[PDB]
Tab-separated table of C-alpha atoms in Angstrom:
chain	number	residue	atom	x	y	z
A	1	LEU	CA	-0.487	-0.094	0.114
A	2	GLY	CA	3.273	1.861	0.082
A	3	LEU	CA	2.165	3.543	4.145
A	4	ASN	CA	4.823	3.518	6.532
A	5	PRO	CA	4.863	-0.368	8.512
A	6	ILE	CA	6.137	1.672	11.473
A	7	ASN	CA	3.652	4.656	12.361
A	8	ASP	CA	1.062	4.800	10.031
A	9	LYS	CA	-1.207	1.779	10.866
A	10	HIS	CA	-4.336	4.272	11.794
A	11	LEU	CA	-4.594	5.095	8.419
A	12	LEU	CA	-6.027	1.814	7.278
A	13	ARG	CA	-9.188	3.104	6.894
A	14	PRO	CA	-11.679	2.765	4.408
A	15	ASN	CA	-11.044	6.085	2.973
A	16	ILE	CA	-7.272	5.877	2.546
A	17	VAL	CA	-7.796	2.516	1.497
A	18	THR	CA	-10.187	-0.010	-0.584
A	19	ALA	CA	-9.887	-3.699	-1.220
A	20	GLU	CA	-11.872	-5.517	-3.533
A	21	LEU	CA	-12.243	-9.786	-4.266
A	22	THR	CA	-13.561	-10.841	-7.264
A	23	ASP	CA	-14.016	-13.095	-10.478
A	24	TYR	CA	-14.184	-11.209	-13.234
A	25	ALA	CA	-17.486	-13.091	-13.248
A	26	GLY	CA	-19.284	-10.558	-11.486
A	27	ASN	CA	-18.275	-11.816	-7.934
A	28	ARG	CA	-17.518	-9.260	-5.364
A	29	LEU	CA	-16.106	-8.898	-1.692
A	30	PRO	CA	-15.719	-5.590	-0.757
A	31	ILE	CA	-13.789	-5.374	2.407
A	32	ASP	CA	-13.258	-2.495	4.466
A	33	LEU	CA	-9.433	-2.603	5.730
A	34	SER	CA	-10.326	-0.560	8.550
A	35	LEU	CA	-11.518	-3.793	10.259
A	36	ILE	CA	-8.480	-6.297	10.301
A	37	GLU	CA	-6.954	-6.100	13.453
A	38	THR	CA	-3.399	-6.923	12.417
A	39	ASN	CA	-2.796	-8.854	8.779
A	40	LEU	CA	-4.776	-9.580	5.863
A	41	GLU	CA	-5.544	-12.596	5.549
A	42	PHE	CA	-8.031	-15.372	3.433
A	43	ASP	CA	-8.576	-18.797	4.211
A	44	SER	CA	-11.233	-21.056	1.988
A	45	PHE	CA	-14.857	-23.106	2.751
A	46	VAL	CA	-14.020	-25.371	0.032
A	47	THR	CA	-16.657	-28.024	-1.348
A	48	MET	CA	-16.579	-30.645	-4.027
A	49	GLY	CA	-17.544	-33.633	-6.508
A	50	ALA	CA	-21.417	-33.766	-5.356
A	51	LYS	CA	-20.754	-29.590	-4.032
A	52	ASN	CA	-18.530	-27.432	-6.412
A	53	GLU	CA	-18.182	-24.207	-4.387
A	54	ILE	CA	-14.915	-22.428	-3.534
A	55	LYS	CA	-16.098	-19.277	-1.271
A	56	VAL	CA	-13.034	-17.058	-0.452
A	57	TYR	CA	-13.278	-15.097	3.688
A	58	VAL	CA	-11.241	-12.795	5.188
A	59	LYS	CA	-9.670	-13.626	7.751
A	60	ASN	CA	-10.500	-12.452	11.733
A	61	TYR	CA	-12.596	-10.413	10.098
A	62	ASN	CA	-14.400	-7.286	12.208
A	63	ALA	CA	-13.141	-9.506	15.024
A	64	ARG	CA	-11.396	-7.968	18.168
A	65	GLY	CA	-9.887	-10.344	17.837
A	66	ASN	CA	-9.245	-13.375	18.013
A	67	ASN	CA	-12.017	-14.689	17.060
A	68	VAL	CA	-13.789	-16.676	14.181
A	69	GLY	CA	-14.990	-12.621	12.531
A	70	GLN	CA	-17.909	-12.454	9.973
A	71	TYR	CA	-16.123	-16.171	9.391
A	72	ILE	CA	-18.043	-17.146	5.446
A	73	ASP	CA	-20.598	-14.704	6.370
A	74	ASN	CA	-19.296	-12.508	4.236
A	75	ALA	CA	-17.008	-13.384	1.505
A	76	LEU	CA	-16.617	-14.659	-2.060
A	77	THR	CA	-18.878	-18.004	-3.374
A	78	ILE	CA	-16.827	-18.935	-6.667
A	79	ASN	CA	-18.884	-21.529	-8.070
A	80	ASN	CA	-20.503	-20.694	-11.469
A	81	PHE	CA	-17.983	-24.251	-12.851
A	82	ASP	CA	-17.972	-25.867	-15.906
A	83	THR	CA	-19.457	-28.725	-17.303
A	84	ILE	CA	-18.344	-30.342	-20.381
A	85	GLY	CA	-20.384	-31.491	-23.192
A	86	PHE	CA	-20.749	-34.952	-24.486
A	87	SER	CA	-22.253	-36.862	-27.976
A	88	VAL	CA	-24.492	-40.717	-27.823
A	89	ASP	CA	-26.145	-43.429	-30.100
A	90	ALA	CA	-27.539	-37.170	-29.126
A	91	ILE	CA	-25.832	-34.719	-27.752
A	92	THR	CA	-25.465	-33.781	-23.909
A	93	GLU	CA	-24.703	-29.897	-23.683
A	94	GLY	CA	-21.407	-28.064	-21.131
A	95	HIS	CA	-22.055	-25.485	-19.541
A	96	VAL	CA	-19.969	-22.765	-20.476
A	97	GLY	CA	-18.370	-21.291	-16.942
A	98	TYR	CA	-15.260	-19.403	-16.245
A	99	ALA	CA	-13.311	-20.951	-19.202
A	100	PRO	CA	-13.200	-18.513	-22.063
A	101	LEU	CA	-10.943	-16.381	-18.529
A	102	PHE	CA	-9.171	-19.656	-18.318
A	103	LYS	CA	-7.543	-19.011	-21.496
A	104	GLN	CA	-6.421	-15.429	-20.832
A	105	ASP	CA	-5.165	-16.521	-17.532
A	106	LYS	CA	-7.475	-14.676	-16.188
A	107	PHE	CA	-9.487	-17.902	-14.165
A	108	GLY	CA	-9.328	-17.231	-9.961
A	109	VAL	CA	-9.545	-14.941	-7.493
A	110	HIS	CA	-8.639	-10.819	-8.067
A	111	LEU	CA	-7.897	-8.972	-5.205
A	112	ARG	CA	-8.349	-4.562	-5.779
A	113	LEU	CA	-5.926	-3.145	-3.371
A	114	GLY	CA	-7.013	0.878	-4.138
B	1	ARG	CA	-9.775	16.508	-11.006
B	2	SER	CA	-11.350	14.314	-8.314
B	3	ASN	CA	-11.604	17.273	-5.765
B	4	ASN	CA	-15.344	19.380	-5.949
B	5	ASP	CA	-13.438	22.313	-6.066
B	6	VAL	CA	-15.235	23.295	-9.160
B	7	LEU	CA	-18.104	26.919	-10.733
B	8	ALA	CA	-21.569	24.906	-10.474
B	9	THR	CA	-22.389	24.103	-14.714
B	10	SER	CA	-25.518	22.917	-16.312
B	11	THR	CA	-25.266	22.181	-19.714
B	12	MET	CA	-23.709	19.745	-20.336
B	13	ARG	CA	-24.746	18.650	-24.239
B	14	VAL	CA	-23.833	15.271	-26.832
B	15	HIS	CA	-20.690	17.358	-27.544
B	16	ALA	CA	-19.072	14.533	-30.358
B	17	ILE	CA	-19.416	10.824	-31.086
B	18	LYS	CA	-17.568	8.109	-32.387
B	19	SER	CA	-19.012	4.606	-33.064
B	20	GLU	CA	-17.403	0.970	-34.313
B	21	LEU	CA	-19.790	-0.286	-36.833
B	22	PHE	CA	-20.125	-3.627	-36.910
B	23	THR	CA	-20.700	-3.365	-40.873
B	24	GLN	CA	-20.061	-6.681	-42.595
B	25	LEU	CA	-20.644	-10.261	-40.783
B	26	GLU	CA	-19.413	-13.583	-40.474
B	27	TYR	CA	-21.727	-17.101	-39.891
B	28	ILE	CA	-21.520	-20.152	-37.468
B	29	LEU	CA	-23.237	-23.092	-38.160
B	30	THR	CA	-23.457	-25.332	-35.635
B	31	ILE	CA	-25.206	-28.286	-36.290
B	32	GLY	CA	-24.519	-32.139	-34.923
B	33	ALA	CA	-23.668	-33.880	-37.764
B	34	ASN	CA	-19.883	-34.265	-39.509
B	35	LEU	CA	-20.647	-32.954	-42.135
B	36	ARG	CA	-17.820	-32.567	-44.108
B	37	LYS	CA	-18.584	-37.133	-45.174
B	38	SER	CA	-21.529	-38.958	-45.940
B	39	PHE	CA	-25.103	-38.516	-46.202
B	40	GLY	CA	-26.549	-41.981	-47.188
B	41	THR	CA	-29.663	-41.016	-49.457
B	42	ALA	CA	-33.498	-40.701	-49.037
B	43	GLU	CA	-34.258	-43.863	-48.171
B	44	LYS	CA	-30.335	-45.138	-47.723
B	45	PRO	CA	-30.173	-42.480	-44.344
B	46	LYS	CA	-25.794	-42.325	-42.675
B	47	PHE	CA	-26.335	-40.356	-39.691
B	48	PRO	CA	-22.213	-38.988	-39.009
B	49	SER	CA	-21.981	-38.134	-35.537
B	50	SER	CA	-20.263	-35.163	-35.554
B	51	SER	CA	-16.395	-34.511	-33.410
B	52	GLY	CA	-16.218	-30.940	-31.653
B	53	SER	CA	-14.120	-28.723	-32.022
B	54	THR	CA	-12.559	-25.793	-29.527
B	55	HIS	CA	-12.335	-22.449	-29.654
B	56	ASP	CA	-11.936	-20.161	-26.334
B	57	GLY	CA	-10.992	-22.562	-24.298
B	58	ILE	CA	-14.079	-24.417	-24.757
B	59	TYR	CA	-16.010	-27.933	-26.002
B	60	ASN	CA	-18.678	-28.109	-28.474
B	61	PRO	CA	-19.592	-31.171	-29.444
B	62	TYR	CA	-21.062	-29.286	-32.277
B	63	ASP	CA	-19.452	-28.560	-35.690
B	64	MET	CA	-19.280	-25.361	-36.388
B	65	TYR	CA	-18.603	-24.306	-39.951
B	66	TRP	CA	-17.402	-20.800	-40.139
B	67	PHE	CA	-19.136	-18.463	-43.207
B	68	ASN	CA	-16.681	-15.179	-43.708
B	69	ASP	CA	-19.714	-14.436	-46.953
B	70	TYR	CA	-22.946	-15.090	-46.588
B	71	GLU	CA	-23.820	-17.014	-50.216
B	72	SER	CA	-21.820	-19.194	-49.279
B	73	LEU	CA	-23.708	-20.281	-46.299
B	74	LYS	CA	-27.155	-19.485	-48.367
B	75	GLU	CA	-25.324	-22.543	-50.610
B	76	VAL	CA	-24.613	-25.204	-47.523
B	77	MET	CA	-27.864	-23.866	-47.108
B	78	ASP	CA	-30.080	-25.083	-49.461
B	79	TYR	CA	-27.570	-28.240	-50.266
B	80	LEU	CA	-28.853	-28.550	-46.737
B	81	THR	CA	-32.537	-29.103	-47.419
B	82	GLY	CA	-31.575	-31.866	-50.050
B	83	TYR	CA	-30.924	-34.215	-46.415
B	84	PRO	CA	-33.377	-33.267	-44.182
B	85	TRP	CA	-32.391	-36.488	-41.595
B	86	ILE	CA	-28.972	-34.107	-41.573
B	87	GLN	CA	-30.067	-30.647	-41.565
B	88	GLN	CA	-32.088	-31.280	-38.019
B	89	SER	CA	-29.375	-31.590	-36.317
B	90	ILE	CA	-28.882	-27.844	-37.006
B	91	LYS	CA	-28.623	-25.834	-32.962
B	92	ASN	CA	-28.862	-22.596	-35.540
B	93	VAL	CA	-26.931	-20.476	-37.762
B	94	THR	CA	-24.950	-17.406	-35.077
B	95	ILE	CA	-24.777	-13.623	-36.837
B	96	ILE	CA	-21.498	-12.236	-35.450
B	97	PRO	CA	-19.919	-9.083	-36.281
B	98	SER	CA	-16.848	-9.597	-38.574
B	99	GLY	CA	-13.065	-10.846	-38.568
B	100	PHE	CA	-13.600	-11.364	-34.494
B	101	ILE	CA	-12.136	-15.177	-35.736
B	102	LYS	CA	-8.549	-15.620	-36.397
B	103	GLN	CA	-7.811	-17.360	-39.959
B	104	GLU	CA	-5.317	-19.892	-37.546
B	105	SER	CA	-8.784	-21.196	-35.834
B	106	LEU	CA	-10.540	-22.058	-39.423
B	107	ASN	CA	-9.884	-25.451	-41.472
B	108	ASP	CA	-9.084	-25.562	-45.164
B	109	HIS	CA	-12.225	-25.715	-47.033
B	110	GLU	CA	-13.883	-29.297	-47.564
B	111	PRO	CA	-16.162	-30.577	-49.656
B	112	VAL	CA	-19.242	-31.188	-48.249
B	113	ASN	CA	-21.494	-34.361	-49.081
B	114	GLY	CA	-20.299	-35.584	-52.139
B	115	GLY	CA	-20.158	-33.183	-53.806
B	116	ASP	CA	-19.256	-29.850	-55.223
B	117	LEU	CA	-19.878	-27.246	-51.974
B	118	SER	CA	-17.303	-26.519	-49.679
B	119	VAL	CA	-17.216	-25.450	-45.229
B	120	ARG	CA	-14.275	-24.423	-42.732
B	121	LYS	CA	-14.914	-25.956	-38.953
B	122	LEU	CA	-14.049	-23.668	-36.139
B	123	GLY	CA	-11.639	-24.971	-33.657
B	124	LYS	CA	-7.955	-25.865	-33.239
B	125	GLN	CA	-7.945	-24.855	-29.974
B	126	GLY	CA	-7.363	-21.792	-31.617
B	127	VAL	CA	-8.934	-17.773	-30.051
B	128	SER	CA	-10.724	-14.605	-30.817
B	129	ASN	CA	-8.888	-12.303	-31.522
B	130	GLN	CA	-10.123	-9.461	-28.621
B	131	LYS	CA	-10.267	-6.639	-31.391
B	132	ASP	CA	-9.066	-3.568	-30.782
B	133	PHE	CA	-11.993	-0.944	-31.001
B	134	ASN	CA	-10.135	1.770	-32.216
B	135	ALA	CA	-12.456	3.690	-34.390
B	136	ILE	CA	-14.008	4.193	-30.861
B	137	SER	CA	-10.938	5.110	-29.283
B	138	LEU	CA	-9.282	8.321	-29.025
B	139	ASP	CA	-5.734	9.013	-27.173
B	140	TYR	CA	-4.845	12.106	-25.147
B	141	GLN	CA	-3.902	14.520	-28.372
B	142	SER	CA	-6.953	13.314	-30.136
B	143	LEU	CA	-9.204	13.435	-27.054
B	144	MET	CA	-9.181	15.989	-26.050
B	145	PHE	CA	-9.178	17.962	-29.598
B	146	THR	CA	-12.013	15.354	-29.902
C	1	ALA	CA	-19.112	-22.559	-28.911
C	2	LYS	CA	-20.460	-19.100	-26.418
C	3	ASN	CA	-21.021	-15.642	-28.590
C	4	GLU	CA	-19.750	-12.327	-26.445
C	5	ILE	CA	-18.141	-9.387	-26.736
C	6	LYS	CA	-17.746	-6.853	-23.332
C	7	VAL	CA	-15.914	-3.705	-24.950
C	8	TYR	CA	-14.083	-1.992	-21.553
C	9	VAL	CA	-11.667	1.033	-20.718
C	10	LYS	CA	-8.282	-0.211	-20.769
C	11	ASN	CA	-6.478	1.204	-17.846
C	12	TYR	CA	-9.761	2.642	-15.936
C	13	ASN	CA	-9.410	3.567	-12.864
C	14	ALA	CA	-6.145	2.143	-12.323
C	15	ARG	CA	-2.917	4.846	-10.885
C	16	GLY	CA	-0.800	2.910	-13.549
C	17	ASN	CA	-0.390	0.717	-14.913
C	18	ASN	CA	-2.120	-1.878	-13.708
C	19	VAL	CA	-4.879	-4.057	-15.496
C	20	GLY	CA	-7.713	-1.942	-14.444
C	21	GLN	CA	-11.123	-2.556	-13.059
C	22	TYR	CA	-10.357	-4.405	-16.120
C	23	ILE	CA	-13.125	-6.034	-17.485
C	24	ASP	CA	-15.451	-5.581	-14.569
C	25	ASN	CA	-16.937	-3.196	-15.911
C	26	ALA	CA	-18.086	-3.048	-19.644
C	27	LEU	CA	-20.431	-2.828	-22.342
C	28	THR	CA	-20.643	-6.337	-23.137
C	29	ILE	CA	-22.662	-7.307	-26.243
C	30	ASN	CA	-24.667	-10.960	-27.062
C	31	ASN	CA	-27.401	-11.094	-27.624
C	32	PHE	CA	-27.013	-12.238	-31.148
C	33	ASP	CA	-29.494	-13.470	-33.594
C	34	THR	CA	-30.140	-16.680	-35.123
C	35	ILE	CA	-31.331	-17.165	-38.429
C	36	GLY	CA	-34.261	-19.857	-39.057
C	37	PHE	CA	-34.847	-22.313	-41.836
C	38	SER	CA	-37.200	-25.197	-42.222
C	39	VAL	CA	-36.943	-28.831	-42.830
C	40	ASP	CA	-39.682	-31.765	-44.705
D	1	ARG	CA	-9.474	3.969	12.604
D	2	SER	CA	-13.360	4.737	12.310
D	3	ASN	CA	-14.163	7.650	12.571
D	4	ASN	CA	-15.385	10.400	10.867
D	5	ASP	CA	-12.094	12.415	12.621
D	6	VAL	CA	-9.951	12.493	8.547
D	7	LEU	CA	-9.055	14.857	5.832
D	8	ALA	CA	-11.416	15.013	3.244
D	9	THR	CA	-10.435	12.958	-0.214
D	10	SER	CA	-11.340	12.358	-3.106
D	11	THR	CA	-8.834	10.568	-4.777
D	12	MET	CA	-8.867	7.298	-4.866
D	13	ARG	CA	-7.189	4.339	-7.335
D	14	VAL	CA	-6.722	0.242	-8.117
D	15	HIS	CA	-2.717	1.539	-6.652
D	16	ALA	CA	-2.006	-2.658	-7.119
D	17	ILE	CA	-3.027	-5.844	-7.448
D	18	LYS	CA	-2.162	-9.844	-6.577
D	19	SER	CA	-3.979	-12.020	-7.919
D	20	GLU	CA	-4.328	-16.511	-6.668
D	21	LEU	CA	-4.770	-17.725	-10.273
D	22	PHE	CA	-5.943	-20.205	-11.424
D	23	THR	CA	-3.091	-21.598	-13.646
D	24	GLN	CA	-4.449	-26.021	-13.484
D	25	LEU	CA	-7.667	-27.489	-13.803
D	26	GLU	CA	-8.930	-31.101	-12.933
D	27	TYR	CA	-11.343	-32.749	-13.616
D	28	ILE	CA	-14.181	-35.256	-12.292
D	29	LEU	CA	-16.309	-36.958	-13.913
D	30	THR	CA	-19.531	-37.953	-12.794
D	31	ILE	CA	-21.778	-41.488	-14.157
D	32	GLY	CA	-23.777	-43.047	-12.623
D	33	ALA	CA	-22.300	-46.347	-13.312
D	34	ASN	CA	-19.329	-48.461	-11.689
D	35	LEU	CA	-16.636	-47.602	-14.962
D	36	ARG	CA	-14.309	-49.877	-12.585
D	37	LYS	CA	-16.186	-52.912	-13.625
D	38	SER	CA	-17.935	-55.328	-16.355
D	39	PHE	CA	-19.958	-53.430	-19.446
D	40	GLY	CA	-20.594	-56.461	-21.135
D	41	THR	CA	-20.952	-56.428	-24.650
D	42	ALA	CA	-23.046	-55.265	-28.489
D	43	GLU	CA	-25.453	-57.853	-27.693
D	44	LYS	CA	-24.678	-58.592	-24.390
D	45	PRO	CA	-24.720	-55.323	-22.754
D	46	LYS	CA	-23.877	-54.962	-18.349
D	47	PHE	CA	-25.062	-52.091	-17.543
D	48	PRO	CA	-23.568	-52.023	-13.173
D	49	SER	CA	-25.050	-50.003	-10.885
């Protein structure tokens, strides 16, 4: 952020710096940078196979430490993954998800620091 | 450029317009049958499944066929009335604006059934031009100028 | 496979030069036409 | 860090970007048939649940 770590901690607040997550597919996670005690650490709650859903969130956000904060009750949730299509001796169709983005090396979660 | 330090103003109007015009079209015929091999005939009918391509990172199990010009497409669509058990496997033909599709994403022509006619299959793992829209772009000088 | 053009302004809102907002705000064009046909 | 005691400001921009990229993929084929056992053949077809 180009802040001085030693005496500028008080500037970590939302009119001076800002932070958002995004999947470039219109899922977003707005982060009030004033509400992290010391650290901008993102964890995830993911499930797979049966249901596919990754929701990344900021750890201990809004906690006066150290409790789970808001936890995942606010998070960027990723979950429109693609399915591939196939045919038989009759085509059942695929679903188009983040593929095109992946082809341009943008399938991922991105953090915007203002 | 961002503060509220500026004089009250109330007189905005459309001062200028630039436009990137889509001015030529392309068509992709996407049916679920391999046009580039044998159809059978009215009572000896062959139903060839389609192989599929990959473009912009997506397997389509339908075959997609390029056409940069409408006639070509007209041709081929006509020929196709001949063979109903084939034309029934059409998903649609979609009209898109010109050259977003790259040569290198395409096969060379291929004879259709017999046939006199030829078609080019979109795929080859290619991607599409991320055209820049220059007509609508303005560089600093051009911008102020405009 | 999917037909979508979304045009966006390069580096918009970036104190450069980073991708900006990128495509997270853009005009997205995607209702293209399909032509109809008949059969026996 | 929370109060309204701070100087008026109007000049936020995207200063920096970090990205966790999904850069390799994995696939899960989920069909309702036990692949790991015998299929039968075109006319002696076995359908294993």
